[PDB]
Amino acid sequence: DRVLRGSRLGAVSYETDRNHDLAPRQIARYRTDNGEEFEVPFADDAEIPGTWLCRNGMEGTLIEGDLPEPKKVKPPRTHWDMLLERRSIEELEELLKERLELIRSRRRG
């Protein structure tokens, strides 16, 4: 019960498109693992991050020898962990000896 008037979620300004001066800027050279190089022009006064998500789609590091060592998290949950939270070492060793005796009796009896 209205008029179909659409608008994309974003504004359109118009200022002076001058290219004679800009802000000064650096260029950081990022490198992924598979021999790729990438250039990302940051500004001058900009804290350049040691890692970066590259255009290729993989997390590339910075080519300067920073060596940040971010100390990543543990692998979340294993089947061994879900076994160990409900069993104990001696009971698992008991079932291990049970299956060892069964494979022995199947092998030579």
Partner DNA sequence: CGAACCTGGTCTTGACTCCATTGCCGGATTTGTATTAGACTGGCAGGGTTGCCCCGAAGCGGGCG
Partner DNA sequence: CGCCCGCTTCGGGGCAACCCTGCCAGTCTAATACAAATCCGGCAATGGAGTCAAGACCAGGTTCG
Interface contacts to other proteins, rule CB under 8 A: 2-18, 21-23, 25, 40-43, 46-49, 53, 55-57
Q: Applying CB under 7 A, which of residues 74, 76, 88, 90 lies at the interface with DNA?
A: 76
CA distance linking residue 97 with residue 12, whole number of Å: 74
Nearest to other proteins of 36, 101 (CB atom): 36
Of 48, 53, 57, 51, the closest CA to residue 72 belongs to 51
In DSSP notation, 52-74 reads EE-SSSSEEEESSS------PPP
Q: How far is the CB of 16 from other proteins (least distance, A)?
A: 7
Under rule CB under 7 A, residue 3 binds DNA = yes
